[PDB]
Protein backbone atom coordinates (compact mmCIF):
# COMPACT_ATOMS: atom_id res chain seq x y z
CA UNK A 1 0.00 0.00 0.00
CA UNK A 2 2.91 2.42 0.65
CA UNK A 3 4.98 1.26 -2.39
CA UNK A 4 2.25 1.27 -5.09
CA UNK A 5 1.10 4.86 -4.30
CA UNK A 6 4.64 6.22 -3.48
CA UNK A 7 5.71 4.78 -6.89
CA UNK A 8 2.53 6.09 -8.65
CA UNK A 9 3.62 9.42 -7.09
CA UNK A 10 7.34 9.04 -8.03
CA UNK A 11 6.50 8.10 -11.65
CA UNK A 12 3.56 10.58 -12.12
CA UNK A 13 5.52 13.52 -10.61
CA UNK A 14 8.62 12.89 -12.76
CA UNK A 15 6.01 12.87 -15.64
CA UNK A 16 3.97 16.01 -14.53
CA UNK A 17 7.11 18.23 -14.50
CA UNK A 18 7.93 16.88 -18.00
CA UNK A 19 4.23 17.18 -19.10
CA UNK A 20 4.12 20.85 -18.04
CA UNK A 21 7.59 21.12 -19.70
CA UNK A 22 6.13 19.57 -22.94
CA UNK A 23 3.02 21.85 -22.97
CA UNK A 24 5.70 24.59 -22.57
CA UNK A 25 7.74 22.87 -25.38
CA UNK A 26 4.64 23.09 -27.67
CA UNK A 27 4.49 26.79 -26.58
CA UNK A 28 8.26 27.10 -27.38
CA UNK A 29 7.86 25.43 -30.83
CA UNK A 30 4.90 27.76 -31.53
CA UNK A 31 7.17 30.71 -30.48
CA UNK A 32 9.81 29.71 -33.17
CA UNK A 33 7.15 29.00 -35.87
CA UNK A 34 5.36 32.27 -34.99
CA UNK A 35 8.83 33.98 -35.44
CA UNK A 36 9.32 32.45 -38.91
CA UNK A 37 5.79 33.66 -39.80
CA UNK A 38 6.12 37.08 -38.00
CA UNK A 39 9.44 38.07 -39.68
CA UNK A 40 7.64 37.61 -43.08
CA UNK A 41 3.93 38.64 -42.64
CA UNK A 42 4.22 41.19 -39.81
CA UNK A 43 7.69 41.57 -41.46
CA UNK A 44 6.00 42.95 -44.66
CA UNK A 45 3.68 44.87 -42.39
CA UNK A 46 7.38 45.88 -41.60
CA UNK A 47 7.22 48.57 -44.32
CA UNK A 48 4.46 49.85 -41.95
CA UNK A 49 5.67 47.69 -38.83
CA UNK A 50 8.58 44.75 -38.19
CA UNK A 51 9.58 41.14 -36.43
CA UNK A 52 10.81 38.82 -33.50
CA UNK B 1 -5.55 56.67 -43.27
CA UNK B 2 -9.14 56.91 -41.89
CA UNK B 3 -9.49 53.52 -43.72
CA UNK B 4 -6.33 52.30 -41.86
CA UNK B 5 -7.37 53.90 -38.49
CA UNK B 6 -10.65 52.00 -39.01
CA UNK B 7 -8.66 48.67 -39.00
CA UNK B 8 -6.71 50.00 -35.95
CA UNK B 9 -10.03 50.83 -34.28
CA UNK B 10 -11.11 47.30 -35.28
CA UNK B 11 -8.03 46.07 -33.29
CA UNK B 12 -8.78 48.44 -30.32
CA UNK B 13 -12.49 47.35 -30.45
CA UNK B 14 -11.37 43.66 -30.72
CA UNK B 15 -9.19 44.38 -27.54
CA UNK B 16 -12.43 45.66 -25.97
CA UNK B 17 -14.23 42.39 -27.06
CA UNK B 18 -11.23 40.19 -25.99
CA UNK B 19 -11.43 41.90 -22.54
CA UNK B 20 -15.26 41.61 -22.48
CA UNK B 21 -15.02 37.84 -23.03
CA UNK B 22 -11.79 37.32 -20.98
CA UNK B 23 -13.03 39.26 -17.89
CA UNK B 24 -16.06 36.93 -18.12
CA UNK B 25 -13.65 33.92 -18.75
CA UNK B 26 -11.42 34.73 -15.70
CA UNK B 27 -14.68 35.09 -13.68
CA UNK B 28 -16.07 31.74 -15.02
CA UNK B 29 -12.72 29.95 -14.31
CA UNK B 30 -12.43 31.63 -10.81
CA UNK B 31 -16.08 30.31 -10.21
CA UNK B 32 -16.76 26.94 -11.99
CA UNK B 33 -14.80 24.88 -9.44
CA UNK B 34 -17.02 26.76 -6.86
CA UNK B 35 -20.27 25.70 -8.72
CA UNK B 36 -20.26 22.22 -10.33
CA UNK B 37 -17.42 20.68 -8.37
CA UNK B 38 -18.90 23.14 -5.77
CA UNK B 39 -21.70 20.56 -5.18
CA UNK B 40 -19.93 17.27 -6.01
CA UNK B 41 -16.99 18.06 -3.58
CA UNK B 42 -19.63 18.98 -0.93
CA UNK B 43 -21.19 15.46 -1.11
CA UNK B 44 -17.58 14.09 -1.24
CA UNK B 45 -16.98 15.93 2.11
CA UNK B 46 -20.38 15.09 3.72
CA UNK B 47 -19.64 11.35 3.23
CA UNK B 48 -16.28 11.85 5.13
CA UNK B 49 -18.26 13.67 7.90
CA UNK B 50 -20.76 10.73 7.66
CA UNK B 51 -17.83 8.20 7.93
CA UNK B 52 -16.60 9.35 11.38
Amino acid sequence: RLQDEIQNMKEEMARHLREYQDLLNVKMALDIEIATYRKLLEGEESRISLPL
Amino acid sequence: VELQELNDRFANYIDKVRFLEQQNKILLAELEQLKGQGKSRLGDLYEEEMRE
Partner: protein
Amino acid sequence: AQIQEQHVQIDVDVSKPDLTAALRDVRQQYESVAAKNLQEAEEWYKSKFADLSEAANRNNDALRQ
Protein backbone atom coordinates in the same frame (compact mmCIF):
# COMPACT_ATOMS: atom_id res chain seq x y z
CA ALA C 1 -15.17 62.96 -54.03
CA GLN C 2 -11.91 61.53 -55.50
CA ILE C 3 -9.93 63.66 -52.91
CA GLN C 4 -12.40 62.56 -50.17
CA GLU C 5 -12.56 58.77 -51.17
CA GLN C 6 -8.98 57.70 -50.71
CA HIS C 7 -9.82 59.29 -47.15
CA VAL C 8 -12.67 57.36 -47.10
CA GLN C 9 -12.60 54.69 -48.20
CA ILE C 10 -10.03 53.52 -50.07
CA ASP C 11 -11.92 51.51 -52.12
CA VAL C 12 -14.24 50.66 -49.06
CA ASP C 13 -12.44 48.31 -46.50
CA VAL C 14 -13.57 45.48 -44.14
CA SER C 15 -10.75 46.72 -41.68
CA LYS C 16 -10.94 43.30 -40.02
CA PRO C 17 -9.23 40.73 -42.35
CA ASP C 18 -11.41 37.57 -41.92
CA LEU C 19 -11.08 33.96 -40.90
CA THR C 20 -7.77 35.13 -39.28
CA ALA C 21 -9.85 35.47 -36.05
CA ALA C 22 -11.38 31.96 -36.35
CA LEU C 23 -7.88 30.49 -37.13
CA ARG C 24 -6.43 31.97 -33.84
CA ASP C 25 -9.61 30.90 -32.02
CA VAL C 26 -9.27 27.36 -33.54
CA ARG C 27 -5.58 27.55 -32.40
CA GLN C 28 -6.49 28.44 -28.77
CA GLN C 29 -9.40 25.91 -28.91
CA TYR C 30 -6.91 23.15 -30.03
CA GLU C 31 -4.65 24.24 -27.10
CA SER C 32 -7.83 24.03 -24.89
CA VAL C 33 -8.73 20.59 -26.43
CA ALA C 34 -5.18 19.43 -25.55
CA ALA C 35 -6.00 20.62 -21.98
CA LYS C 36 -9.37 18.69 -22.11
CA ASN C 37 -7.54 15.55 -23.36
CA LEU C 38 -5.09 16.02 -20.41
CA GLN C 39 -8.07 16.42 -17.98
CA GLU C 40 -9.63 13.17 -19.33
CA ALA C 41 -6.14 11.57 -19.12
CA GLU C 42 -6.26 12.35 -15.35
CA GLU C 43 -9.54 10.30 -15.30
CA TRP C 44 -7.51 7.57 -17.16
CA TYR C 45 -4.71 8.03 -14.54
CA LYS C 46 -7.29 7.65 -11.68
CA SER C 47 -8.65 4.52 -13.45
CA LYS C 48 -5.14 2.89 -13.47
CA PHE C 49 -4.51 4.12 -9.91
CA ALA C 50 -7.82 2.33 -9.04
CA ASP C 51 -6.56 -0.88 -10.82
CA LEU C 52 -3.45 -0.53 -8.53
CA SER C 53 -5.47 0.31 -5.37
CA GLU C 54 -7.85 -2.66 -5.85
CA ALA C 55 -4.96 -5.07 -6.69
CA ALA C 56 -3.23 -3.83 -3.48
CA ASN C 57 -6.51 -4.37 -1.48
CA ARG C 58 -7.25 -7.88 -2.94
CA ASN C 59 -3.69 -9.20 -2.35
CA ASN C 60 -3.81 -7.64 1.16
CA ASP C 61 -7.13 -9.44 1.92
CA ALA C 62 -5.63 -12.69 0.49
CA LEU C 63 -2.64 -12.38 2.97
CA ARG C 64 -5.00 -11.26 5.83
CA GLN C 65 -7.04 -14.43 5.00
